[PDB]
Design a protein around this ligand. Structure first.
Ligand SMILES: [Cu+]
Ligand SMILES: [Cu+]
Ligand SMILES: [Zn+2]
Ligand SMILES: [Zn+2]
Lengths: 153, 153
């Protein structure tokens, strides 16, 4: 199965995020290319609950968290399913890369198809900040761009 | 279950299409409000296969047709699952309305979540034109606006 989200906004940030998962048990490969970010920075990157774009990136809702855990890093045992950590931007403000994740799925009851990908204007503290907020959003800040995850071939 | 698609394009057409289905067996209620169309006209309205917006509305692909039937009207027994017929625009070029459909579903193997809604620049001939094209696209023409169907609450 393949899916794709086109990130759009009014802040100069835009990009494309691709997802690929063969079977439900296999890890999903996430590949992204995002431009217009601050250069040489780390930016919060997550899958939010709703694929609702009626109110910009606001209507995307909170981080996808069907298991009701706290916010963490992708490598943490305790994390939201949608937690993809920070992407690093280069000297030209481009974030490009890929990774495999075992919690994010395109198949099954926790499928992210129809939900949203959100790139933030700030750095995700990975739930390590000493604030209640750190455990909810990672203090990643505003949402300059987002897109609904759709099916593709 | 509720889903929504925000129709965007570069042609001045934009809108919102909402979907609601309680259980898989129940009809899905489709409500729409689309502006910027030609006034007092009929415009093709369908669910296309892919929720891929990487190449405008082009990457949405063909009409969603898992059962491999020919193009028809929503009331035809032989139609594509994604065939929603024509929407009528008023004197101000606004198409607003709602209907219930039993082939379009948000639940199950034929779910349209993650696919696209496309509003056309032309009238759908409902598969009644005497052309091979009539049986594939209804000769509805260009795709001024489209959106990926995402989950909402
Ligand atoms: Cu986020
Ligand atoms: Cu169409
Ligand atoms: Zn989180
Ligand atoms: Zn059709």
């Amino acid at each position: 199965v393949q899916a794709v989200a086109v990130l759009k906004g009014d802040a100069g940030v835009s990009g494309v995020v691709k997802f690929e998962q063969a079977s439900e048990s296999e890890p999903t490969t996430v590949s992204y290319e995002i431009a217009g970010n601050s250069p040489n920075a780390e930016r919060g990157f997550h899958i939010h609950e709703f694929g609702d774009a009626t109110n910009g990136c606001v209507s995307a809702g909170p981080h996808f968290n069907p298991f009701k855990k706290t916010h963490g890093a992708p490598t943490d045992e305790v994390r939201h399913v949608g937690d993809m950590g920070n992407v690093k931007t280069d000297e030209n403000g481009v974030a490009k890369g890929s990774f495999k994740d075992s919690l994010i799925k395109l198949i099954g009851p926790t499928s992210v198809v129809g939900r949203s990908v959100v790139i933030h204007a700030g750095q995700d503290d990975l739930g390590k900040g000493d604030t209640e907020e750190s455990l909810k959003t990672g203090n990643a800040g505003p949402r300059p761009a987002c897109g609904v995850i759709g099916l593709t071939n």
